[PDB]
Amino acid sequence: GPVPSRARVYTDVNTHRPSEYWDYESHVVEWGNQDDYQLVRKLGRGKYSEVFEAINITNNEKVVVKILKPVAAAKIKREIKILENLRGGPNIITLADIVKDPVSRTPALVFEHVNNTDFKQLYQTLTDYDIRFYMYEILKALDYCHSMGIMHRDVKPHNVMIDHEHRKLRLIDWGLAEFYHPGQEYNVRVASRYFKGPELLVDYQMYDYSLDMWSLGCMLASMIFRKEPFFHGHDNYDQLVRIAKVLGTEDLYDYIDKYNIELDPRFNDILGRHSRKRWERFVHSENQHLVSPEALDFLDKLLRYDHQSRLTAREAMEHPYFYTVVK
Numbered sequence: 001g002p003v004p005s006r007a008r009v010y011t012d013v014n015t016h017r018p019s020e021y022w023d024y025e026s027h028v029v030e031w032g033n034q035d036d037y038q039l040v041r042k043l044g045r046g047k048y049s050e051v052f053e054a055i056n057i058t059n060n061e062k063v064v065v066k067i068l069k070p071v072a073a074a075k076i077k078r079e080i081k082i083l084e085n086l087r088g089g090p091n092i093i094t095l096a097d098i099v100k101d102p103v104s105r106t107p108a109l110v111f112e113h114v115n116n117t118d119f120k121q122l123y124q125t126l127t128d129y130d131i132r133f134y135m136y137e138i139l140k141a142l143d144y145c146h147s148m149g150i151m152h153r154d155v156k157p158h159n160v161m162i163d164h165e166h167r168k169l170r171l172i173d174w175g176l177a178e179f180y181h182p183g184q185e186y187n188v189r190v191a192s193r194y195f196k197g198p199e200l201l202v203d204y205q206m207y208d209y210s211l212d213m214w215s216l217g218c219m220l221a222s223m224i225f226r227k228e229p230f231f232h233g234h235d236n237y238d239q240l241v242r243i244a245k246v247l248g249t250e251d252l253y254d255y256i257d258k259y260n261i262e263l264d265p266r267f268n269d270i271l272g273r274h275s276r277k278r279w280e281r282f283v284h285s286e287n288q289h290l291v292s293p294e295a296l297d298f299l300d301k302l303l304r305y306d307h308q309s310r311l312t313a314r315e316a317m318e319h320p321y322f323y324t325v326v327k
């Protein structure tokens with residue numbers, strides 16, 4: 001069967017924590033008062049929740065209310081525990097309250113407001129400097145949550161809120177986040193299609209924090225090459241083919257061999273044989289100002305099939321690509 005894997009960093013953070021830290025099912029929710037909030041407008045509705053711009057009538061501050069759909073109400077204690085554990089961390093959204101919705105009784109999470117847009121609205125219009133700057137800010141959030149024993153598992157541009165005017169960023173939507181426990185097999189149906197790492201696509205369950213680093217690499221490729229999304233798969237199988245057309249098939253097969261991964265027989269008739277491509281192939285006159293040897297070297301060290309071979313968030317922060325960012 002599959003060869004086991006463990007994170008190369010922050011491996012045992014949860015083993016040394018009291019059970020209260022990671023045993024979310026044991027957590028007692030000290031519920032707040034639904035009447036303290038006034039809903040202004042619907043910011044959007046996904047398949048798992050509804051988000052609203054709101055006002056806390058007890059202190060007159062603008063908040064954001066996220067009401068969980070009956071389906072996604074099951075692991076509310078997990079999201080609460082993770083949000084409470086990470087509260088005050090750099091670039092992490094701050095959970096202000098947890099209330100029950102009045103008409104549906106489903107839990108509603110209350111967050112501090114973020115004044116400007118979604119990162120997907122901005123990330124295709126940024127300068128080279130701003131790409132570097134905002135990548136570094138995301139890395140601060142990822143290193144913090146990984147250091148706290150938590151994998152985000154849904155890193156994507158829609159989950160990064162950017163206040164471009166104040167040059168501030170928040171990583172949001174911790175609904176898929178999970179505690180890392182070495183040796184645990186996790187559900188591979190996490191992250192959005194275009195940001196899923198190859199470990200999810202080949203059904204390798206013993207993944208770790210490095211999944212978020214693949215997703216961040218997809219975001220970086222999209223930004224520096226002005227190609228959204230960078231890996232445009234039609235479904236989860238074609239997603240792996242899109243990746244293999246760039247990274248090649250030799251390294252994919254070396255990866256499945258290393259971990260004794262059983263490849264779905266449907267991949268034999270669609271993967272084919274592909275050459276490991278040079279990142280300069282995606283460089284054109286309209287994006288050349290966003291590309292540098294440092295950007296390509298950094299991207300190359302994120303987008304690796306082998307999850308153990310990717311840069312960690314702290315190693316990524318050390319990369320020369322960020323030397324030009326004021327710290």
Ligand SMILES: COc1[nH]c2ccc(F)cc2c1C(=O)OCC1CCN(CCNS(=O)(=O)c2ccccc2)CC1
Pocket residue numbers: 034035036037038039045048049050065066067068069070099100101102103104105106107108
């Ligand atoms: C006193 O004023 C309020 N205070 C709140 C505090 C939290 C909150 F969730 C809603 C309110 C709230 C209010 O006006 O709520 C009105 C609606 C807001 C939406 N809910 C839930 C809708 N049903 S649902 O199944 O929970 C759902 C459907 C679709 C997406 C996500 C969840 C029904 C009542």
